[PDB]
Design a protein around this ligand. Structure first.
Ligand SMILES: *[C@@H]1O[C@H](CO)[C@@H](O)[C@H](O)[C@H]1NC(C)=O
Ligand SMILES: [Zn+2]
Ligand SMILES: [Zn+2]
Ligand SMILES: [Zn+2]
Length: 233
């Protein structure tokens, strides 16, 4: 279970506003999450996530998220991106961050008076997939392959990030990436650990667009999606 932490995602804001009791519980399931990381339809989850237990659709702004950019950046800037993983239930896998460079598509996710349909969520997801921010765009960042993949499979791609191996004796799983302290970021279930990387923002301007986080599991069929409202100026 996890969600995007920095920049602050809609999910983070929904928990901090007192609405979402389990920000890490916004899950896309049942799906095939592995090895073809992009084949499963996103359904109601969309690029921003849907939290089933409080019926919270993060693809639509409310007074508590989505009105405005939470943070402003420059085109091409290399930025910190962090997600928070709950200790109970971290089983590794692969994750990524994406920016859709089609403002008219994104705009349907920025309107508090409009709820994107599942078809619109999927077209947006496709735009996000085209706008994936590769690990390898950041000079000096080490971008390895998953210990849960073999060459020839659709998971063998180092544009996505990988968690550490599940089976490692030292620093396994997603928690092992940073080896941070317990409750270094909030989760509701058992306490949270940061998972930190860098991405290079596209050379693109917007006063209000989205960065969408996606995390795919290998051992079970599940995907976690979040999105953050940002500006690139
Ligand atoms: C952002 O809005 C300001 C007006 O408040 C405008 O001058 C500027 O060009 C806009 N930037 C983008 C990227 O559209
Ligand atoms: Zn695919
Ligand atoms: Zn607006
Ligand atoms: Zn357009």
């Amino acid at each position: 279970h996890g969600y995007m932490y920095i920049p602050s995602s809609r999910t983070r804001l929904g928990h901090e506003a007192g609405i979402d009791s389990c920000p890490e519980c916004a899950i896309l399931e049942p799906v095939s999450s592995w090895p073809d990381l992009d084949a499963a339809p996103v359904g109601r989850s969309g690029p921003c996530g849907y939290n089933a237990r409080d019926s919270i659709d993060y693809n639509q702004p409310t007074t508590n998220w989505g009105s405005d950019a939470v943070q402003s950046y420059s085109p091409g800037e290399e930025i910190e991106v962090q997600w928070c993983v709950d200790h109970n239930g971290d089983h590794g896998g692969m994750f990524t961050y994406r920016i859709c460079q089609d403002q008219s598509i994104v705009d349907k996710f920025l309107d508090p008076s409009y709820l994107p349909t599942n078809d619109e969520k999927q077209a947006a997801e496709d735009c996000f997939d085209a706008g994936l921010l590769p690990c390898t765009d950041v000079s000096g960042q080490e971008c390895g392959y998953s210990a849960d993949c073999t060459e020839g499979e659709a998971c063998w791609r180092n544009d996505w990030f990988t968690c550490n191996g599940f089976e490692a004796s030292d620093r396994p799983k997603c928690q092992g990436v940073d080896n941070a302290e317990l409750n270094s970021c909030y989760t509701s279930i058992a306490g949270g650990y940061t998972v930190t990387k860098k991405v290079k923002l596209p050379e693109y301007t917007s006063n209000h667009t989205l960065i969408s986080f996606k995390w795919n599991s290998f051992q079970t069929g599940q995907i976690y999606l979040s999105c953050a409202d940002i500006a690139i100026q």
